[PDB]
Design a protein around this nucleic acid. Structure first.
Ligand SMILES: Nc1nc2c(ncn2[C@@H]2O[C@H](COP(=O)(O)OP(=O)(O)CP(=O)(O)O)[C@@H](O)[C@H]2O)c(=O)[nH]1
Ligand SMILES: [Mg+2]
Ligand SMILES: [Mg+2]
Ligand SMILES: [Mg+2]
Ligand SMILES: [Mg+2]
Ligand SMILES: [Mg+2]
Ligand SMILES: [Mg+2]
Ligand SMILES: [Mg+2]
Ligand SMILES: [Mg+2]
Ligand SMILES: [Mg+2]
Ligand SMILES: [Mg+2]
Ligand SMILES: [Mg+2]
Ligand SMILES: [Mg+2]
Ligand SMILES: [Mg+2]
Ligand SMILES: [Mg+2]
Ligand SMILES: [Mg+2]
Ligand SMILES: [Mg+2]
Ligand SMILES: [Mg+2]
Ligand SMILES: [Mg+2]
Ligand SMILES: [Mg+2]
Ligand SMILES: [Mg+2]
Ligand SMILES: [Mg+2]
Ligand SMILES: [Mg+2]
Ligand SMILES: [Mg+2]
Ligand SMILES: [Mg+2]
Ligand SMILES: [Mg+2]
Ligand SMILES: [Mg+2]
Ligand SMILES: [Mg+2]
Ligand SMILES: [Mg+2]
Ligand SMILES: [Mg+2]
Ligand SMILES: [Mg+2]
Ligand SMILES: [Mg+2]
Ligand SMILES: [Mg+2]
Ligand SMILES: [Mg+2]
Ligand SMILES: [Mg+2]
Ligand SMILES: [Mg+2]
Ligand SMILES: [Mg+2]
Ligand SMILES: [Mg+2]
Ligand SMILES: [Mg+2]
Ligand SMILES: [Mg+2]
Ligand SMILES: [Mg+2]
Ligand SMILES: [Mg+2]
Ligand SMILES: [Mg+2]
Ligand SMILES: [Mg+2]
Ligand SMILES: [Mg+2]
Ligand SMILES: [Mg+2]
Ligand SMILES: [Mg+2]
Ligand SMILES: [Mg+2]
Ligand SMILES: [Mg+2]
Ligand SMILES: [Mg+2]
Ligand SMILES: [Mg+2]
Ligand SMILES: [Mg+2]
Ligand SMILES: [Mg+2]
Ligand SMILES: [Mg+2]
Ligand SMILES: [Mg+2]
Ligand SMILES: [Mg+2]
Ligand SMILES: [Mg+2]
Ligand SMILES: [Mg+2]
Ligand SMILES: [Mg+2]
Ligand SMILES: [Mg+2]
Ligand SMILES: [Mg+2]
Ligand SMILES: [Mg+2]
Ligand SMILES: [Mg+2]
Ligand SMILES: [Mg+2]
Ligand SMILES: [Mg+2]
Ligand SMILES: [Mg+2]
Ligand SMILES: [Mg+2]
Ligand SMILES: [Mg+2]
Ligand SMILES: [Mg+2]
Ligand SMILES: [Mg+2]
Ligand SMILES: [Mg+2]
Ligand SMILES: [Mg+2]
Ligand SMILES: [Mg+2]
Ligand SMILES: [Mg+2]
Ligand SMILES: [Mg+2]
Ligand SMILES: [Mg+2]
Ligand SMILES: [Mg+2]
Ligand SMILES: [Mg+2]
Ligand SMILES: [Mg+2]
Ligand SMILES: [Mg+2]
Ligand SMILES: [Mg+2]
Ligand SMILES: [Mg+2]
Ligand SMILES: [Mg+2]
Ligand SMILES: [Mg+2]
Ligand SMILES: [Mg+2]
Ligand SMILES: [Mg+2]
Ligand SMILES: [Mg+2]
Ligand SMILES: [Mg+2]
Ligand SMILES: [Mg+2]
Ligand SMILES: [Mg+2]
Ligand SMILES: [Mg+2]
Lengths: 416, 134, 76
RNA sequence: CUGGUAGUUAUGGCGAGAAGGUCACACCCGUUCCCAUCCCGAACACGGUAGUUAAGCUUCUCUGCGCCAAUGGUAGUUGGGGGCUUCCCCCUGCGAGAGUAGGUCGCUGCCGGG
RNA sequence: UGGGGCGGUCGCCUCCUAAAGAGUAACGGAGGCGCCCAAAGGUUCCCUCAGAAUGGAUGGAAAUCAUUCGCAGAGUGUAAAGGCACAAGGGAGCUUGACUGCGAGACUGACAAGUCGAGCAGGGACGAAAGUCGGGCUUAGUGAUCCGGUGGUUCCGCAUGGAAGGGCCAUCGCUCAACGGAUAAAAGCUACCCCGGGGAUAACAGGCUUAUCUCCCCCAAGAGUCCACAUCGACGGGGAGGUUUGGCACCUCGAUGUCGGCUCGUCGCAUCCUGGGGCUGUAGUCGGUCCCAAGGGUUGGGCUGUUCGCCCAUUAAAGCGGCACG
RNA sequence: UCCUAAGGUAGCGAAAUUCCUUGUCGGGUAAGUUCCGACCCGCACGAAAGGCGCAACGAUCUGGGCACUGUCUCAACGAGAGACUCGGUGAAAUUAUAGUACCUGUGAAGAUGCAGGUUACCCGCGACAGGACGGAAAGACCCCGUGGAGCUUUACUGCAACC
RNA sequence: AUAGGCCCAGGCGACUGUUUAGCAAAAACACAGGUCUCUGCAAAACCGUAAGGUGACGUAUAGGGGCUGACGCCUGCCCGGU
RNA sequence: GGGUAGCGGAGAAAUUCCAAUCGAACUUGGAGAUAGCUGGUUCUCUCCGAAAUAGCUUUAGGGCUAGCCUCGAGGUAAAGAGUCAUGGAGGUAGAGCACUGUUUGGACUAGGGGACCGAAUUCAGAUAAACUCCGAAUGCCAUGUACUUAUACUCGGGAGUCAGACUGCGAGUGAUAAGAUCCGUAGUCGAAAGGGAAACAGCCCAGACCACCAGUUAAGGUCCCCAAAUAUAUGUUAAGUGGAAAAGGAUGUGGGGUUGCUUAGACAACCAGGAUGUUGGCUUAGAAGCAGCCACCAUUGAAAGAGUGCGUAAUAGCUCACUGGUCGAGUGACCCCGCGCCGAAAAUGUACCGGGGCUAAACAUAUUACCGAAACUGUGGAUGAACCU
């Protein structure tokens, strides 16, 4: 495990004590031993070193007396700040932006995600080509009037050759959207309602789905990855849930997300967060035990705003209510639920909640199905919830709560 | 992923792969083996991939022996560097495999699953192989 | 960008006279470090471990006990 | 038979067991003298022989360890010729390492006592 | 010097490359040196290590004892290699051979230089004697000439006697380290530049290679409302092309004009549209993917020198590349 | 609280100065990497190398409008001087000898001349520029030469002048 | 036949003028104004080996040199180093 | 009309002007400055014939000494070359774990732990340019009186060379790329013509003294261009493979070796049966062989599953496993080997046999004739050296 160091400044932030300990957890995930940490209270970042010429001395001092090799900075660095910090430390440096890119590149097990990481990582290098251009300009070849060589300057050329790779990945990533819409064709051709779980990382998202599947799914042997790791899930998964009274819907998962996320990964997120934009309901799971939960909501709602997830009704779910002392879960107030995704009751209570938003238009009805030719009695007993059935001599009178698309699909069999 | 903890010298010659295997050409521990028919270099990533693909199929049943280890190391130069100015920085570890070497082992499972697991492993390696029995 | 690149000139060690070849007194028979060959009859060891004949004769590389050799000179 | 002293790549060594002797050789007794201990008559040096084969020493038996060691086969390879050239094949000459059949509880020379 | 510059290096010792004599290159792979010792040298006599187990223990994983096992698992001033237990390793006594004049004969070697040496003479140290001793177990610890300083001298001394001054022997003064040392004495800019040469050597274009790049596949964990293969396919593996970023330096320096546009085009198919067909998560409309097909088509503007890109408005469609980036 | 001789004041600020950069917001346009107005987050503004403004002036640089138009969509026609035919006079750069095709390949790695094929009766006149790595100029760019010259300095050694 | 196209906004330079005969007419040079410094007359400064001259047939409201460049508002801190 | 002259003058300053010339005018002299640099260097024949390497160098495209060439003269205890016999030094290829590193599985465990990590021991199995208990083939140094064969050495006069190239083998750098770069070893080119690779310095054969309208062969070839076999015998290929390219895929084709049933009737077909407790029991609105779970006997029989597939909604229905008969010659299961198939895409024009064209005029094994060079021979000439008369 590599030994690294953690550096950051205040610069008018409001959770500098919290945004500094994420960078410890983000470093643990990338398999680095955080040896020490540096904090400086300043109002604005330095234009040349990000910390001011003073503290550059005691990062060099501290990394020499702690055997560090890499320095992580809590915020993204300008190309010039990177250039100046290198020479002043003669050590590898890395900002927070590249720390997620190191996390995502090691946990992308599909080219769906692998292409998106790689295009975003290439857009990061384009501004740094200048510093690469500056150092490579020492051996400029020099001279003057050549009359027999090349076109423009070297800085023009090496900028063109890196933009060329970007547009190629853009073409490949554009064709990715066409592929994913083919797999949604059956869902969209029908009108199966879809509800998408969202929320901060380690909120209890997978734990919820893996419970609603083991209880109300025909193929219960289709579980998901629930663990203690940060960023366990990095994909969307769909599962068909069928309630005991013969109602069906689709439950989707989502990759969790953290604050200070690079703006060139949200463009990749925009693709992977498509199931939520078309969701007809959202479940916002929040880590209720952490006192930093109120701040967790803000960073996730300001993130759904970027990708176009809006106007979908939301129900806020507060997980981990077992840990809180004297908590009488489950309980519902407003659009808010208190539960723990471990007991069946919370999961049995949650399912009865969603039924109100999705299936509220299924109204009472009656029908008369002749015995001689049936094959509709089966249909009622699947696409409805029978209450009572009166097997008569004329045939089979039935009473059931059928969908509005089944009233007029069976408008001839209905009786008074 | 198999990597030696220590090395006396960082840089090494590349060597040659002439002749049959010096030893280890007979299956000893298990009852099924994967024997190379031609000679090739095997990196540690290929060993990892083959082992994973072969253990997943048996569903954590039986035992598997890795009969080769990547003692050697190899170096490389970045794009845009002229020739000279010393040797390159090491990149990975390889196991020079000569023909006739048995380099995987299976025991504790019947004929079918063992043969299928060996077949699944053999597609991850860059060398032509065959399945032998004790 | 290279810390290596240096060596020492060779010292031309080895055997300077062959077995069975007539040899003149005082001539070097073997240049060597330490004692890979021991001095036998009518031969001595120099300050830096060379072996030189002491009388005119014929060179012969015999064998001492199992794991070591010697060279001797026999007059005519 | 035994004491002394040399040669020979342990086939001679290590280990195990038995027998023997005051003819020789040792153990043994002593510190006045010559001589000695980073202290000590343990050793070395000197003066003696009440007791002993317990050990040293000699002889006898073994294959447990070690050591020496073929024949056949094989790898490799000089020369000549071929291929589908990470390397491979054919003809002639040379020819291992490992493994094994097997061998070993030594063989010789000189001087003094019995 | 895989163009030059920046970086690194320049002398000597040890090992691998070095292909079982010796020798053998690269800006190939690893290390050391520019000293130290008055005993860490000579001689005579004596003996033998690391480590492990058991008990006392102040005192533990580890101090100092006692027994047993123990071929070197230690040590050898120092880097490595070769060697050394009949010591070249460890003690004690006496001493200064860490001497003077030499040296048959050899090794190495273009020269200058470097290395070994029996034995003779003078006078000694240790030892009863035989005998050993011209520094250190062996190989690094060092620089010529010229010019000056210090000591000795039966040498010369410009008419003669002296002297001044030289000669000979011994010895001192170098990071002359760019270490066979140009001089006692030495840094930069040139886009205002000039001459003699070179494709022996760089920038454009051609050539070889294909790491990289584009495209095509093999196995199949998985995703896809169940469901590996409608549509994607991770970890790994195999090729084709010569459009990218690179490597090499083969033609051209007695000149091969170098970016974008304009005019004119012409080829390839890995097909953007149109034509024919298979599968579909193909009810219909709208689509996806693959197969056969190169016959014709494949816009007008705002910003930027821009190729490219973003945007406005259309279109059946607004293809990707080669031709000295035509 | 440390160090220094002391720690950038006013004014201005994506600038003839900002790499990231087409910074962010507003205006202008159907669409504005250029332009104007703001923010300050000044890689690397800043006070006589002057800082910030400023009426008049400018064959100065930059952005937008009215009018006007062959600059363009997209090219017609007409006049004159050449060019074209006839009579007079009459050069030059260049030049190894030439009865001087195309394709694929080979070769000092880009062939009219070499190999295999495919085409081609002999001689001219008016036109166009793909090739003859076409003509002109012993490449300026690059490197080399123990070549040169001009310039600088706390490189070495000197000289004038002054004390 | 001959005889101003006009308007809005910004950078630079205050203005008229000068400049690379033969690629660059400009934001570059000059300028009026500001400031620092040297010079008491055989003045300082400059040419010349000297004689002899310019400065000047002048005399500190005069003469030589450095920087800035109309005009308006201003021109901050440091004398350790040279 | 005059003034300022080059170690200088003038400059509202641009290295600007000083007779079409100015980062320092023109002219004559020193002067035939110097040039380790480029170019040039004129008649013939005869004999011999290299090098592109080492050390040092203000040295790297220059020089010096040595190495390699040539001419002359010397002296023999003949010293040069090849093979044979004999003796040696040396640790590479290979192999091995006896030392040192790297390393896999198992047993036990010091030590800490109120079971778990884990030092050392052992068992079995690997690995090494800078590991070695071992250790070749070649090469090298000598001895000989063995047998052949012609050089060696010393002294002196004269040089040139110090940019090398590719191919085979052994290594390094590189990516186990390059017509790359740098060494060792052998060859060819350089300095080599002739024949074959279509064309072609370096690949294969082979070394031109001159003439001939003579002969035999080498590499390579014999249907036509184009000299010589539409040769002989036995087989394989159907792909124009031959005449380009992998992982991977496959009822292509030929030859062998194994193994079930069968004229007391094999496989493929057709005719007939293919049933009863019973809808096996749970589960469900149901579940009747075929949503799911557990079980899976018996009855008649020659056979017949508490059911292989399709189907309903549950049924209904179609069909299979199995048995009897009908016709009457073989029919499935595995392994090895040879040759083929797909994978297979580029830019002026067929364009991955030189062309035509080939089903052999391709491939494998064996045999025999011929063609084929400036090679060797035959005939006639010219000439150098050594040694004899
Ligand atoms: N104490 C407590 N822990 C819970 C509760 N629900 C889930 N967790 C824990 O939270 C941990 C985080 O796992 P989970 O939240 O499922 O992962 P995730 O939400 O998919 C993270 P991402 O959003 O990036 O995919 C789990 O280890 C789980 O045990 C709860 O109600 N109480
Ligand atoms: Mg320049
Ligand atoms: Mg240029
Ligand atoms: Mg999740
Ligand atoms: Mg050496
Ligand atoms: Mg000595
Ligand atoms: Mg010495
Ligand atoms: Mg007796
Ligand atoms: Mg006494
Ligand atoms: Mg022995
Ligand atoms: Mg044998
Ligand atoms: Mg043997
Ligand atoms: Mg050799
Ligand atoms: Mg050698
Ligand atoms: Mg070297
Ligand atoms: Mg060093
Ligand atoms: Mg001198
Ligand atoms: Mg005298
Ligand atoms: Mg006198
Ligand atoms: Mg040094
Ligand atoms: Mg010098
Ligand atoms: Mg030198
Ligand atoms: Mg030297
Ligand atoms: Mg300029
Ligand atoms: Mg020139
Ligand atoms: Mg060249
Ligand atoms: Mg090029
Ligand atoms: Mg060209
Ligand atoms: Mg070269
Ligand atoms: Mg020319
Ligand atoms: Mg096609
Ligand atoms: Mg279709
Ligand atoms: Mg077409
Ligand atoms: Mg406009
Ligand atoms: Mg072009
Ligand atoms: Mg190109
Ligand atoms: Mg090209
Ligand atoms: Mg801007
Ligand atoms: Mg501007
Ligand atoms: Mg804007
Ligand atoms: Mg602005
Ligand atoms: Mg300024
Ligand atoms: Mg100032
Ligand atoms: Mg100004
Ligand atoms: Mg201003
Ligand atoms: Mg103004
Ligand atoms: Mg003017
Ligand atoms: Mg006319
Ligand atoms: Mg005329
Ligand atoms: Mg070619
Ligand atoms: Mg051509
Ligand atoms: Mg032709
Ligand atoms: Mg004409
Ligand atoms: Mg030309
Ligand atoms: Mg020239
Ligand atoms: Mg000069
Ligand atoms: Mg002006
Ligand atoms: Mg001009
Ligand atoms: Mg006057
Ligand atoms: Mg000014
Ligand atoms: Mg001031
Ligand atoms: Mg001062
Ligand atoms: Mg002062
Ligand atoms: Mg005049
Ligand atoms: Mg002047
Ligand atoms: Mg200038
Ligand atoms: Mg001029
Ligand atoms: Mg002027
Ligand atoms: Mg002029
Ligand atoms: Mg002269
Ligand atoms: Mg000749
Ligand atoms: Mg030359
Ligand atoms: Mg010479
Ligand atoms: Mg080996
Ligand atoms: Mg000579
Ligand atoms: Mg040389
Ligand atoms: Mg050379
Ligand atoms: Mg060479
Ligand atoms: Mg090569
Ligand atoms: Mg080459
Ligand atoms: Mg030549
Ligand atoms: Mg030839
Ligand atoms: Mg030829
Ligand atoms: Mg050819
Ligand atoms: Mg014929
Ligand atoms: Mg073919
Ligand atoms: Mg195949
Ligand atoms: Mg074509
Ligand atoms: Mg014939
Ligand atoms: Mg002849
Ligand atoms: Mg004749």
């Amino acid at each position: 495990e590599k030994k690294v160091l953690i550096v950051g400044i205040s610069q008018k932030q409001k959770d500098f004590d919290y945004s500094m300990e994420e960078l410890a957890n983000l470093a643990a995930a990338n398999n680095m031993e955080v040896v020490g940490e540096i904090r400086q209270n300043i109002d604005r970042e330095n234009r040349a070193t990000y910390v001011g010429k003073g503290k550059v001395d005691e990062i060099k001092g501290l990394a020499e007396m702690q055997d560090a090799r890499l320095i992580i900075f809590n915020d993204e660095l300008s190309p010039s700040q990177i250039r100046n910090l290198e020479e002043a430390l003669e050590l590898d440096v890395m900002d927070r932006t590249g720390l997620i890119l190191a996390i995502f590149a090691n946990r992308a097990k599909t080219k769906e995600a692998q292409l998106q990481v790689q295009i975003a990582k290439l857009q990061y290098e384009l501004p740094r080509i200048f510093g690469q251009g500056e150092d490579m300009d020492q051996q400029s070849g020099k001279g003057g009037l050549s009359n027999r060589g090349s076109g423009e300057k070297k800085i023009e050329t090496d900028r063109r050759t890196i933009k060329h790779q970007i547009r190629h990945l853009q073409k490949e990533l554009d064709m990715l959207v066409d592929d994913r819409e083919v797999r949604r064709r059956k869902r969209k051709k029908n009108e199966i309602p879809v509800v998408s779980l969202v929320g901060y990382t380690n909120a209890g998202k997978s734990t919820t789905m893996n419970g609603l599947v083991r209880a109300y799914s025909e193929t219960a042997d289709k579980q998901v990855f629930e663990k203690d790791m940060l960023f366990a899930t990095l994909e969307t998964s769909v599962r068909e849930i069928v309630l005991p009274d013969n109602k069906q819907f689709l439950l989707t998962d989502t990759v969790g997300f953290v604050s200070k996320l690079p703006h060139q990964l949200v463009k990749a997120f925009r693709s992977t967060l498509e199931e939520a934009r078309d969701a007809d309901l959202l479940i916002h799971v929040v880590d209720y035990s952490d006192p930093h939960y109120k701040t967790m909501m803000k960073t996730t709602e300001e993130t759904l705003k970027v990708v176009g997830v809006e106007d979908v009704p939301v129900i806020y779910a507060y997980n981990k209510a077992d840990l809180l002392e004297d908590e009488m879960y489950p309980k519902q107030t407003g659009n808010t639920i208190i539960f723990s995704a471990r007991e069946e009751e919370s999961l049995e209570f949650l399912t009865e909640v969603i039924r109100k938003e999705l299936f509220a238009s299924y109204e009472k009805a009656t029908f008369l199905i002749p015995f001689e030719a049936g094959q509709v009695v089966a249909y009622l007993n699947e696409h409805a919830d029978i209450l009572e059935t009166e097997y008569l001599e004329n045939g089979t009178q039935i009473v059931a709560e059928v969908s509005p698309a089944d009233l007029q699909k069976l408008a001839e069999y209905q009786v008074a | 992923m198999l990597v030696p903890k220590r090395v006396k010298y960082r840089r090494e010659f590349r060597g040659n792969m002439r002749g049959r295997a010096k030893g280890g050409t007979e299956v000893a521990f298990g009852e099924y083996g994967l024997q190379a028919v031609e000679a090739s270099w095997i990196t540690n990533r290929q060993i990892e991939a083959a082992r994973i693909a072969m253990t997943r199929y048996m569903k954590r049943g039986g035992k598997v022996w890795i009969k080769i280890f990547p003692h050697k190391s190899y170096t490389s130069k970045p794009i845009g560097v002229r020739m000279g100015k010393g040797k390159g920085a090491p990149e990975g570890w390889v196991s020079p495999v000569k023909r006739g070497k048995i380099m995987f082992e299976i025991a504790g499972v019947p004929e079918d699953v063992a043969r299928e697991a060996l077949r699944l492993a053999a597609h991850k390696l860059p060398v032509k192989t065959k399945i032998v029995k004790r | 960008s290279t810390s290596n690149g240096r060596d020492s000139e060779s010292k031309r060690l080895g055997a300077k006279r062959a077995d069975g070849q007539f040899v003149t007194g005082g001539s070097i028979l073997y240049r060597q470090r330490g004692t890979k060959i021991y001095p036998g009859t009518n031969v001595g060891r120099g300050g830096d471990d060379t072996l030189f004949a002491k009388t005119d004769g014929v060179v012969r590389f015999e064998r001492m006990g199992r794991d070591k050799k010697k060279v001797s000179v026999y007059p005519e």
